[PDB]
Amino acid sequence: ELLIRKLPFQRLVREIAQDFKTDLRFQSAAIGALQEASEAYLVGLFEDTNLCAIHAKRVTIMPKDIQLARRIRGER
Amino acid sequence: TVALREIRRYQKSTELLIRKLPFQRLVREIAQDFKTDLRFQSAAIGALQEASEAYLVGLFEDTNLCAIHAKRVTIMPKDIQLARRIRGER
Amino acid sequence: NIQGITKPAIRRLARRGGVKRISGLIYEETRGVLKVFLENVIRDAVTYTEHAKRKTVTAMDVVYALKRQGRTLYGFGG
Amino acid sequence: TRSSRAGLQFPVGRVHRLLRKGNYSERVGAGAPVYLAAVLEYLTAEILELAGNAARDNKKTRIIPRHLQLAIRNDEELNKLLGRVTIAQGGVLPNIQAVLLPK
Amino acid sequence: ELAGNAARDNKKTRIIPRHL
Amino acid sequence: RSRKESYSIYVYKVLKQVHPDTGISSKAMGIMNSFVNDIFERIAGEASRLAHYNKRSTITSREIQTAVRLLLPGELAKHAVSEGTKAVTKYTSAK
Amino acid sequence: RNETTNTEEEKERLRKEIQKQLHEKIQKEGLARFNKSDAQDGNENHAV
Amino acid sequence: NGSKNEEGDYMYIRLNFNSPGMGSSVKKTELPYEDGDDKEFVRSLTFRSTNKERMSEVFKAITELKKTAVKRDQERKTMEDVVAQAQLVEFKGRPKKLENVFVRPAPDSKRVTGTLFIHQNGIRYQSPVRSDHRVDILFSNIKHLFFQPCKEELMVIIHCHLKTPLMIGKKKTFDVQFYREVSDVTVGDEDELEQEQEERRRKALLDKEFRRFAEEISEASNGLLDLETPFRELGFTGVPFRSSVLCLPTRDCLIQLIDTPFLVVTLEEIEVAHLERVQFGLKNFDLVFVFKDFSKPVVHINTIPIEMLEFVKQWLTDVDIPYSEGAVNLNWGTIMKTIQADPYEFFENGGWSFLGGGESDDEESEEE
DNA sequence: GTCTGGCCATCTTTGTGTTTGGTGTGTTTGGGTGGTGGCCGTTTTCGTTGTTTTTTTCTGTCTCGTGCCTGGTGTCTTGGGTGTAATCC
Numbered sequence A: 001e002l003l004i005r006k007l008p009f010q011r012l013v014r015e016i017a018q019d020f021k022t023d024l025r026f027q028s029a030a031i032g033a034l035q036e037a038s039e040a041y042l043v044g045l046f047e048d049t050n051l052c053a054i055h056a057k058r059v060t061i062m063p064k065d066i067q068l069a070r071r072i073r074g075e076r
Numbered sequence B: 001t002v003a004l005r006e007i008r009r010y011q012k013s014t015e016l017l018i019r020k021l022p023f024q025r026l027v028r029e030i031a032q033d034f035k036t037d038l039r040f041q042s043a044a045i046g047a048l049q050e051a052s053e054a055y056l057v058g059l060f061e062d063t064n065l066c067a068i069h070a071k072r073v074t075i076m077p078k079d080i081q082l083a084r085r086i087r088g089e090r
Numbered sequence C: 001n002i003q004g005i006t007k008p009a010i011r012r013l014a015r016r017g018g019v020k021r022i023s024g025l026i027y028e029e030t031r032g033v034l035k036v037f038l039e040n041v042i043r044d045a046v047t048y049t050e051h052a053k054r055k056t057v058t059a060m061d062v063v064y065a066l067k068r069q070g071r072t073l074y075g076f077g078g
Numbered sequence D: 001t002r003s004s005r006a007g008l009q010f011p012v013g014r015v016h017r018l019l020r021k022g023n024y025s026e027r028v029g030a031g032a033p034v035y036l037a038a039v040l041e042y043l044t045a046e047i048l049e050l051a052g053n054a055a056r057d058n059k060k061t062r063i064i065p066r067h068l069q070l071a072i073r074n075d076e077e078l079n080k081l082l083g084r085v086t087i088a089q090g091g092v093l094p095n096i097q098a099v100l101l102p103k
Numbered sequence E: 001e002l003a004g005n006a007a008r009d010n011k012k013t014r015i016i017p018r019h020l
Numbered sequence F: 001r002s003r004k005e006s007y008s009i010y011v012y013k014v015l016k017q018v019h020p021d022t023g024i025s026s027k028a029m030g031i032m033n034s035f036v037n038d039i040f041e042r043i044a045g046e047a048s049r050l051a052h053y054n055k056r057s058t059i060t061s062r063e064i065q066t067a068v069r070l071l072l073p074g075e076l077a078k079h080a081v082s083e084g085t086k087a088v089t090k091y092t093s094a095k
Numbered sequence G: 001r002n003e004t005t006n007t008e009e010e011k012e013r014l015r016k017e018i019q020k021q022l023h024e025k026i027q028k029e030g031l032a033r034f035n036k037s038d039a040q041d042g043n044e045n046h047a048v
Numbered sequence H: 001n002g003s004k005n006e007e008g009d010y011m012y013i014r015l016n017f018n019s020p021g022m023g024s025s026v027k028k029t030e031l032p033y034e035d036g037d038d039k040e041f042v043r044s045l046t047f048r049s050t051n052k053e054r055m056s057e058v059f060k061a062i063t064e065l066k067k068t069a070v071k072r073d074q075e076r077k078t079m080e081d082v083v084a085q086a087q088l089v090e091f092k093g094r095p096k097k098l099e100n101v102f103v104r105p106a107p108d109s110k111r112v113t114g115t116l117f118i119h120q121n122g123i124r125y126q127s128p129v130r131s132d133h134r135v136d137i138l139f140s141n142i143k144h145l146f147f148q149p150c151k152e153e154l155m156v157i158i159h160c161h162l163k164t165p166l167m168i169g170k171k172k173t174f175d176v177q178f179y180r181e182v183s184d185v186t187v188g189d190e191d192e193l194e195q196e197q198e199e200r201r202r203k204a205l206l207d208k209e210f211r212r213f214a215e216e217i218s219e220a221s222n223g224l225l226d227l228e229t230p231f232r233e234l235g236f237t238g239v240p241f242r243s244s245v246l247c248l249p250t251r252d253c254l255i256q257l258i259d260t261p262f263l264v265v266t267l268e269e270i271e272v273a274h275l276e277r278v279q280f281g282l283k284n285f286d287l288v289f290v291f292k293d294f295s296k297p298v299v300h301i302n303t304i305p306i307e308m309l310e311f312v313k314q315w316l317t318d319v320d321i322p323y324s325e326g327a328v329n330l331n332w333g334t335i336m337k338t339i340q341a342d343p344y345e346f347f348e349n350g351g352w353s354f355l356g357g358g359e360s361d362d363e364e365s366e367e368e
Numbered sequence I: 001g002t003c004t005g006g007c008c009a010t011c012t013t014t015g016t017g018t019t020t021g022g023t024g025t026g027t028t029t030g031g032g033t034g035g036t037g038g039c040c041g042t043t044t045t046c047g048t049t050g051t052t053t054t055t056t057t058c059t060g061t062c063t064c065g066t067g068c069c070t071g072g073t074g075t076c077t078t079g080g081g082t083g084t085a086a087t088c089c
Helices: A004-017 A028-055 A061-075 B002-012 B020-031 B042-069 B079-088 C007-016 C024-053 C058-070 D011-019 D029-058 D065-074 D076-082 E003-008 F008-018 F026-052 F060-069 F072-094 G002-033 G037-041 H053-081 H190-218 H306-318 H331-341 H343-349 H349-355
Strands: H002-007 H010-016 H044-049 H096-106 H116-117 H122-126 H132-137 H142-148 H155-168 H171-181 H236-238 H245-249 H253-256 H263-266 H270-278 H284-292 H299-304 H325-326
Touching: A004 A028, A004 H270, A028 A061, A028 B042, A028 B079, A028 H299, A061 B042, B002 H331, B020 B042, B042 C007, B042 C058, B079 C024, B079 H155, C007 C024, C007 G002, C024 C058, C024 H263, C024 H325, D011 D029, D011 F026, D011 H263, D029 D076, D029 F008, D029 F060, D065 D076, D065 F026, D076 F072, E003 G002, F026 F060, F026 H132, F060 F072, G002 H306, G002 H349, G037 H343, H002 H053, H002 H343, H010 H053, H044 H053, H044 H116, H096 H190, H116 H190, H116 H245, H116 H270, H132 H155, H142 H190, H142 H253, H142 H263, H155 H253, H236 H299, H236 H306, H263 H270, H270 H349, H284 H306, H284 H331, H299 H306, H299 H325, H325 H349, H331 H343
Parallel strands: H270 H325
Antiparallel strands: H002 H010, H010 H044, H096 H116, H096 H171, H116 H122, H122 H132, H142 H155, H155 H171, H236 H245, H245 H253, H253 H263, H270 H284, H284 H299
């Protein structure tokens, strides 16, 4: 089951969409797919961050581990 | 100091760092396990060598990043395995 | 023929990659990684060649096999 | 020619023929090849501009693959566009990490 | 086949996205 | 003989249009030809996918423009769309 | 391949049957090791 | 604990004492006070003095006395589980010996090569630099004896896993490893091939020497000790501690001997295996071993590649170990305390069945 | 003596261009339908409101873990030293 609350996520998506074209409508399944993709992406990113943090002999994930993960993935 | 001199020297040049005949022999040895009596254009071997060196240099850059992340100067096999896992290769 | 990738060559590749100190097992690890990469690429190239009903591996097969992996190469007729 | 009518140097007939023989669509409108040729001409002009700058920076009057690699990897938008391509004889950018530098 | 195996290891008759 | 086509003369003309006192090696001309072919293939594949999504049999300039927008980054896409629109209007105004 | 996946999956039904026998075996083993008399004799680790 | 504050002409010391509520890091089994709901406690006393220097010295001396007391109590606790062993009986003839061996854990901070000797009731490691750095291991105290050859590793190993822990230098250990690194610096294509051949000959010679010596240890034990060799082909990668390592099955144990800390899991001591984070879209799962002795902490092997899942399930079945799978990581530290509190009630309810996700035993019928 | 530069005495085949000529794009007109446009339907997306209660939050407390500092190892290279070595008065 999805971990981010559905209505705050809807509001975030609408707020972000408000820049590219004013007053857009969204299907419900569109927001559901966006939430599934976002949570899958974040879980993978937390997996890589955990791997880096363990590599550094730690157990706490820190922002530099995220930065290293996004660098190695090739993310900008 | 000679290490840094070599780093400066090799990030300047573009010439292939593997000898041609060993790489050709390796390619033929590998290819012989899929089909006997195969021929290779010299440009195919050249392209393979360029791609392999570019791949290995990118991998060594990621490995160096991992090693510096752990606070080490020395790259280790665990660094390579971690970089290849994070890329999504292993 | 995998011994032909000598230790100085791996050292040179690491120096162009900016690596300052190298362990002793890095050479075997790199040989394994290179073998896996070359195995995949040559397998794809030979698949292309067999499909084209040829006995010679051209540069086009290598270029298409790299495009298949996502390793697009410029300057070989692509 | 159709290149002259549009004030272009790239070919319109060749691009239309390649679009026609490439199994892309049943029919191809007449404003697509002109637009695509203009885009390709703009992108090659940008690439060649930066590569000529990079070659003059090295005091050379001829562009080699090294200058193409430097122009690509030095421009943020191009380097994001050509993010997966490797250039034969392009080399790498000079980059030494902060912690490896001597003391 | 493997989805049926996984649904049978969870004592379930219906295949769901979890088993896929 | 084998009369195979390329973009070398056009790349050379563009170079002399932007940089008059600068030449180009043959290996770089090969790389530029490969680059042009690659970008063509990307744009045409995106245009085809868009046409098939929208149930149309035709590749027009709208598909090309939106594929350019999808593919290139912001400023680059903006300049490219500007150039393409300029060229299309100049070609359409005359005949 | 279909007859091999049937064969492999019947070996996997034997794998599951073994796993079920192992869970039933350990349940009974634990029930024998621990009697209700040991539960009555609770060596409460009162803080020493 | 206490604090010191300087205020005008006076120095203040606050001394805090142990009370419930403001409790120390001590476990529930041993309190620094006697249990009592009706007991009232002196929580803190604050003193002042005009003499600042002496009052600072008094505070330092209180703090030092506490550090010495805590150190002595830790040393006592580390010694409570050290069973006094019998004395090693020296062999009256020429003992069988293995030269140029390193020991882990090292009895001294300095890594020194030593000689390993076979005696009548055990083995003795003896450093040439100091006679006082002897390590004696009785055959009766060895639980498992492993030989790990140098094939893809740079070292050959002879590992002794112990029934009772030994004090080596300042460290209590269940594991004593004897090893020798073959890593040698050796530098046209003929010379490199000759060096690679010489390295292969050195590896094969060292493996033959260490294997023979490990067989001679097993023989000298009069059949008390079997020599185990790991099955490399059945090995899988995982993270039991802080590094990714190759875990290797043997006849009777799951081992990792290359990197410290060592992993030695005896298969017969396992009660159940639990596979955590087995869910669609994850690349890696975790494996948890629960022991028959519920007082022993569970062993985690983290970040196992999902490609090895069906192999690990097969291997656990072939070894008669029950397994369960779950999408979530469990709080084993709470579960094992509940099971320790009443093991009988735990098996009465159903025992390990709760690990099989949810026992709905009903058709989902999600499709309308 | 460090380091990036502006150049050299010799290697190598490349790089810009003219040329022959042929094929591939360009003009012309004809047809058939794809794609725009308009008009209608009706589902679905936004919008709000009330009531419940799970989730978020602020905070406190304690401890465990991260990060800094230390001894000792192996390793390449620079330097001061001395004994081997020896002949002259």
